[PDB]
Design a protein around this ligand. Structure first.
Ligand SMILES: Nc1ncnc2c1ncn2[C@@H]1O[C@H](COP(=O)(O)OP(=O)(O)O)[C@@H](O)[C@H]1OP(=O)(O)O
Ligand SMILES: CC1(C)N=C(N)N=C(N)N1c1ccc(Cl)cc1
Length: 159
């Protein structure tokens, strides 16, 4: 079970300036809920952008993809090929752009959060992985977060 999880604006933007371009505590809780107790897979650059205080993300098997054999990722494990990361009974790829792309052909599930905000793509923006017509699933109802930011959840799957 290889899966991809991400949160995007409507336009497909999932990150800008090194930041998630919105505040959505319901997304963080959603993310935790899907991935808790399973393996998470991230690129080295993504681990590098998490505060030392927060990494590894707790209650989950943290795997970090890197070419550097000497890479220090305390509390996590480091693998040097996509094949080796995607082993466990249930894996969620959590970022970033290179790892999303890399892992796409192996994915049979996506969990997405679409956030109702109009952010036309700009050069440099991190972008959601592109879903083709092989996918099927549920595009859920719009929902107001506590702050009044609107978001909805996709739950898609394939062979
Ligand atoms: N095919 C591959 N094999 C091994 N490591 C890879 C890989 N593709 C990407 N990576 C790692 O994953 C990193 C990318 O992580 P990321 O997906 O979080 O980056 P970004 O935020 O730019 O999309 C790459 O820099 C590379 O790490 P190192 O720079 O430490 O080598
Ligand atoms: C919190 C957030 C944005 N939310 C969802 N739905 N999916 C992810 N992969 N996330 C995410 C989690 C950890 C990291 Cl390092 C990056 C993005």
């Amino acid at each position: 079970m290889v899966g991809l999880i991400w949160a995007q604006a409507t336009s497909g933007v999932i990150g800008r300036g090194g930041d998630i371009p919105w505040r959505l505590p319901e997304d963080q809780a959603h993310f935790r809920e899907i991935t808790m107790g399973h393996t998470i897979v991230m690129g080295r650059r993504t681990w590098d952008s998490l505060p030392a205080k927060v990494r590894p993300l707790p209650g989950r098997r943290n795997v970090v993809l890197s070419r550097q054999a000497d890479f220090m990722a305390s509390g996590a494990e480091v693998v040097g090929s996509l094949e080796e990361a995607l082993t466990s009974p249930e894996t969620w790829v959590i970022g970033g752009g290179q790892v999303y792309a890399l892992a796409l052909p192996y994915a049979t599930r996506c969990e997405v959060t679409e956030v109702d905000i109009g952010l036309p793509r700009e050069a440099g923006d991190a972008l959601a992985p592109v879903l083709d017509e092989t996918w099927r699933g549920e595009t859920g109802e719009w929902r107001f977060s506590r702050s009044g930011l609107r978001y909805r959840l996709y739950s898609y799957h394939r062979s």
